[PDB]
Design an enzyme around this catalytic site. Structure first.
Site, PDB file in Angstrom:
ATOM      1  N   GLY A 258      -2.674   8.100  13.615  1.00 25.62           N
ATOM      2  CA  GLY A 258      -2.432   8.961  12.465  1.00 25.62           C
ATOM      3  C   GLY A 258      -2.768   8.245  11.172  1.00 25.62           C
ATOM      4  O   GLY A 258      -2.927   7.025  11.129  1.00 25.62           O
TER       5      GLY A 258
ATOM      6  N   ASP B 213       9.692   1.727  10.616  1.00 23.15           N
ATOM      7  CA  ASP B 213       9.470   1.897   9.171  1.00 23.15           C
ATOM      8  C   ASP B 213      10.619   1.353   8.330  1.00 23.15           C
ATOM      9  O   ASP B 213      10.991   1.938   7.311  1.00 23.15           O
ATOM     10  CB  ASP B 213       9.218   3.350   8.776  1.00 23.15           C
ATOM     11  CG  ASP B 213       7.784   3.741   8.917  1.00 23.15           C
ATOM     12  OD1 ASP B 213       7.005   2.919   9.421  1.00 23.15           O
ATOM     13  OD2 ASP B 213       7.411   4.807   8.384  1.00 23.15           O
TER      14      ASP B 213
ATOM     15  N   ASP C 282      14.628   4.891   4.605  1.00 20.35           N
ATOM     16  CA  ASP C 282      13.742   5.990   4.967  1.00 20.35           C
ATOM     17  C   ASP C 282      14.007   6.453   6.399  1.00 20.35           C
ATOM     18  O   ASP C 282      13.072   6.741   7.156  1.00 20.35           O
ATOM     19  CB  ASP C 282      12.267   5.601   4.793  1.00 20.35           C
ATOM     20  CG  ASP C 282      11.323   6.806   4.861  1.00 20.35           C
ATOM     21  OD1 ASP C 282      10.095   6.600   4.981  1.00 20.35           O
ATOM     22  OD2 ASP C 282      11.801   7.959   4.795  1.00 20.35           O
TER      23      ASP C 282
ATOM     24  N   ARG D 228      11.091  11.572  11.844  1.00 18.14           N
ATOM     25  CA  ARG D 228       9.709  11.103  11.892  1.00 18.14           C
ATOM     26  C   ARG D 228       9.604   9.587  12.008  1.00 18.14           C
ATOM     27  O   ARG D 228       8.545   9.092  12.394  1.00 18.14           O
ATOM     28  CB  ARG D 228       8.947  11.539  10.639  1.00 18.14           C
ATOM     29  CG  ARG D 228       9.474  10.884   9.349  1.00 18.14           C
ATOM     30  CD  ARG D 228       8.706  11.369   8.125  1.00 18.14           C
ATOM     31  NE  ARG D 228       9.356  10.855   6.920  1.00 18.14           N
ATOM     32  CZ  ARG D 228      10.362  11.466   6.295  1.00 18.14           C
ATOM     33  NH1 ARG D 228      10.812  12.631   6.733  1.00 18.14           N
ATOM     34  NH2 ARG D 228      10.912  10.914   5.223  1.00 18.14           N
ATOM     35  N   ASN D 229      10.666   8.852  11.664  1.00 18.75           N
ATOM     36  CA  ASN D 229      10.678   7.395  11.699  1.00 18.75           C
ATOM     37  C   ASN D 229      11.498   6.859  12.854  1.00 18.75           C
ATOM     38  O   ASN D 229      11.972   5.722  12.800  1.00 18.75           O
ATOM     39  CB  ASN D 229      11.179   6.821  10.376  1.00 18.75           C
ATOM     40  CG  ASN D 229      10.120   6.923   9.305  1.00 18.75           C
ATOM     41  OD1 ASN D 229       8.923   6.959   9.617  1.00 18.75           O
ATOM     42  ND2 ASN D 229      10.535   6.986   8.055  1.00 18.75           N
TER      43      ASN D 229
ATOM     44  N   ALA E  29      -1.189   8.759   3.159  1.00 14.78           N
ATOM     45  CA  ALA E  29      -1.340   7.993   1.929  1.00 14.78           C
ATOM     46  C   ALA E  29      -1.005   6.529   2.171  1.00 14.78           C
ATOM     47  O   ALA E  29      -1.583   5.639   1.537  1.00 14.78           O
ATOM     48  CB  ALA E  29      -0.447   8.572   0.829  1.00 14.78           C
ATOM     49  N   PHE E  30      -0.110   6.269   3.125  1.00 12.64           N
ATOM     50  CA  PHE E  30       0.325   4.909   3.417  1.00 12.64           C
ATOM     51  C   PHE E  30      -0.789   4.071   4.023  1.00 12.64           C
ATOM     52  O   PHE E  30      -0.795   2.846   3.863  1.00 12.64           O
ATOM     53  CB  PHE E  30       1.477   4.947   4.425  1.00 12.64           C
ATOM     54  CG  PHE E  30       1.050   5.415   5.805  1.00 12.64           C
ATOM     55  CD1 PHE E  30       1.050   6.762   6.121  1.00 12.64           C
ATOM     56  CD2 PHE E  30       0.614   4.511   6.767  1.00 12.64           C
ATOM     57  CE1 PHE E  30       0.643   7.205   7.369  1.00 12.64           C
ATOM     58  CE2 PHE E  30       0.196   4.943   8.012  1.00 12.64           C
ATOM     59  CZ  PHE E  30       0.210   6.291   8.317  1.00 12.64           C
TER      60      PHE E  30
HETATM   61  C1  N7Z Z   1       6.461  11.831  13.401  1.00 10.92           C
HETATM   62  C2  N7Z Z   1       4.948  11.836  13.083  1.00 10.92           C
HETATM   63  C3  N7Z Z   1       4.379  10.427  13.353  1.00 10.92           C
HETATM   64  O1  N7Z Z   1       5.024   9.452  12.979  1.00 10.92           O
HETATM   65  N1  N7Z Z   1       3.175  10.352  13.979  1.00 10.92           N
HETATM   66  C4  N7Z Z   1       2.690   9.107  14.225  1.00 10.92           C
HETATM   67  C5  N7Z Z   1       3.064   8.329  15.343  1.00 10.92           C
HETATM   68  C6  N7Z Z   1       2.546   7.030  15.521  1.00 10.92           C
HETATM   69  C7  N7Z Z   1       2.847   6.231  16.606  1.00 10.92           C
HETATM   70  C8  N7Z Z   1       2.657   6.715  17.832  1.00 10.92           C
HETATM   71  N2  N7Z Z   1       2.966   5.771  18.739  1.00 10.92           N
HETATM   72  C9  N7Z Z   1       3.346   4.693  18.057  1.00 10.92           C
HETATM   73  N3  N7Z Z   1       3.753   3.511  18.557  1.00 10.92           N
HETATM   74  C10 N7Z Z   1       4.118   2.493  17.727  1.00 10.92           C
HETATM   75  N4  N7Z Z   1       4.041   2.733  16.371  1.00 10.92           N
HETATM   76  C11 N7Z Z   1       3.638   3.910  15.873  1.00 10.92           C
HETATM   77  N5  N7Z Z   1       3.622   4.033  14.512  1.00 10.92           N
HETATM   78  C12 N7Z Z   1       3.931   2.961  13.705  1.00 10.92           C
HETATM   79  C13 N7Z Z   1       4.906   3.052  12.706  1.00 10.92           C
HETATM   80  C14 N7Z Z   1       5.214   1.977  11.853  1.00 10.92           C
HETATM   81  C15 N7Z Z   1       4.552   0.755  12.004  1.00 10.92           C
HETATM   82  O2  N7Z Z   1       4.795  -0.357  11.236  1.00 10.92           O
HETATM   83  C16 N7Z Z   1       6.106  -0.224  10.656  1.00 10.92           C
HETATM   84  C17 N7Z Z   1       6.205  -0.157   9.273  1.00 10.92           C
HETATM   85  C18 N7Z Z   1       7.124  -0.992   8.642  1.00 10.92           C
HETATM   86  C19 N7Z Z   1       7.289  -0.952   7.266  1.00 10.92           C
HETATM   87  C20 N7Z Z   1       6.534  -0.056   6.521  1.00 10.92           C
HETATM   88  C21 N7Z Z   1       5.628   0.778   7.167  1.00 10.92           C
HETATM   89  N6  N7Z Z   1       5.482   0.719   8.561  1.00 10.92           N
HETATM   90  C22 N7Z Z   1       3.593   0.632  12.999  1.00 10.92           C
HETATM   91 CL1  N7Z Z   1       2.755  -0.873  13.234  1.00 10.92          CL
HETATM   92  C23 N7Z Z   1       3.287   1.722  13.811  1.00 10.92           C
HETATM   93  C24 N7Z Z   1       3.274   4.932  16.711  1.00 10.92           C
HETATM   94  C25 N7Z Z   1       1.612   6.590  14.577  1.00 10.92           C
HETATM   95  C26 N7Z Z   1       1.218   7.348  13.464  1.00 10.92           C
HETATM   96  C27 N7Z Z   1       1.773   8.614  13.299  1.00 10.92           C
HETATM   97  O3  N7Z Z   1       1.450   9.457  12.248  1.00 10.92           O
HETATM   98  C28 N7Z Z   1       1.034   8.776  11.066  1.00 10.92           C
HETATM   99  C29 N7Z Z   1       0.794   9.827   9.959  1.00 10.92           C
HETATM  100  C30 N7Z Z   1       2.141  10.314   9.419  1.00 10.92           C
HETATM  101  O4  N7Z Z   1       2.922   9.186   9.013  1.00 10.92           O
END
Ligand code: N7Z
Length: 266
Positions: free
Chosen positions: A21, A154, A136, A140-141, A24-25
């Protein structure tokens, strides 16, 4: 700091294979962690933050993220610092909990829902024990490792999520463990409505006047008064009157022993 917990990864050590996904982040990729001197390929998620315009402070926060040791909080496995910050952690194959409950609403029973409430409260209690404020928390997180093992993600960042924020965070930019408890209440409401949007259609700038008037998210149809009263306690104006995460673990654990008593589903 316990530096050994955090891997500083070389660009060759991880591969982005598919997009998970973007926003903006930044962008999150599904990929492989291929550590040098090992014979293994580890499924990971890689979040590449949007390029900004320094390294010592970033690593300090990353060390804290790598130091979290709880089954219900995602741990930072590795970091790669270049023009961008790239965060590497275990892949959570079922995705975010918000999308999960939306996709499986017909098939989610009361024990599942109450177990998720317990697990999220355990993860938040761990963060509080570490004197760490999330800021946060939302469905979703919360990520789904397997259907009955979820983890909070997150945390550690150091569109403002107005609809999840305690009134004092909106009005005074005060963030505490008790404002996290407010967000926990909204997160529970998301789960119990199978992923409804809180205050749907209401502009963000209008939310504080809703809260000021005493209005709150409505009681979800499946929730008995017992469950809803916990949620409403999370949204009290007096932050010290809200439940503690330690108390939320106990209450939702009790309800998870007799789930049909507290949620009326199907
Ligand atoms: C609910 C909608 C949503 O979040 N969709 C997603 C899901 C993921 C996703 C899917 N499987 C995964 N496995 C492990 N990680 C992720 N995502 C993810 C989240 C955070 C991460 O880092 C943490 C962090 C710390 C501080 C600040 C910011 N981030 C990491 Cl490394 C991985 C995951 C992935 C994306 C996604 O949609 C993204 C668009 C909407 O946000």
């Amino acid at each position: 700091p316990n530096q050994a917990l955090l891997r500083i990864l070389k660009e060759t050590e991880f591969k982005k294979i598919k997009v998970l996904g973007s926003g903006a982040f930044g962008t999150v990729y599904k990929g492989l962690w291929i550590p040098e001197g090992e014979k293994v390929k580890i499924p990971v998620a890689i979040k590449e933050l949007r390029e900004a315009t320094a390294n010592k402070e970033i690593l300090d926060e990353a060390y804290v993220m790598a130091s979290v040791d709880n089954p219900h909080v995602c741990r930072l496995l590795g970091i790669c610092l270049t023009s961008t910050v790239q965060l590497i952690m275990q892949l959570m194959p079922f995705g975010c909990l918000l999308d999960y409950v939306r996709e499986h609403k017909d098939n989610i029973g009361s024990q599942y829902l109450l177990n998720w409430c317990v697990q999220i409260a355990k993860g938040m209690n761990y963060l509080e024990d570490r004197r760490l404020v999330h800021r946060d928390l939302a469905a979703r997180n919360v990520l789904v490792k397997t259907p009955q093992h979820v983890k909070i993600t997150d945390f550690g960042l150091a569109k403002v999520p107005i609809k999840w924020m305690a009134l004092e965070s909106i009005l005074h930019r005060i963030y505490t463990h008790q404002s996290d408890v407010w967000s926990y209440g909204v997160t529970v409401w998301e789960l119990m409505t199978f992923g409804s949007k809180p205050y749907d259609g209401i502009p963000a700038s209008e939310i504080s006047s809703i809260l000021e008037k005493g209005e709150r998210l409505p009681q979800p149809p499946i929730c008995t008064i017992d469950v809803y009263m916990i949620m409403r306690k999370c949204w009290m104006i007096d932050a010290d009157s809200r439940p503690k995460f330690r108390e939320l673990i106990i209450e939702f654990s009790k309800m998870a022993r007799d789930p049909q008593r507290y949620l009326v589903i199907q």
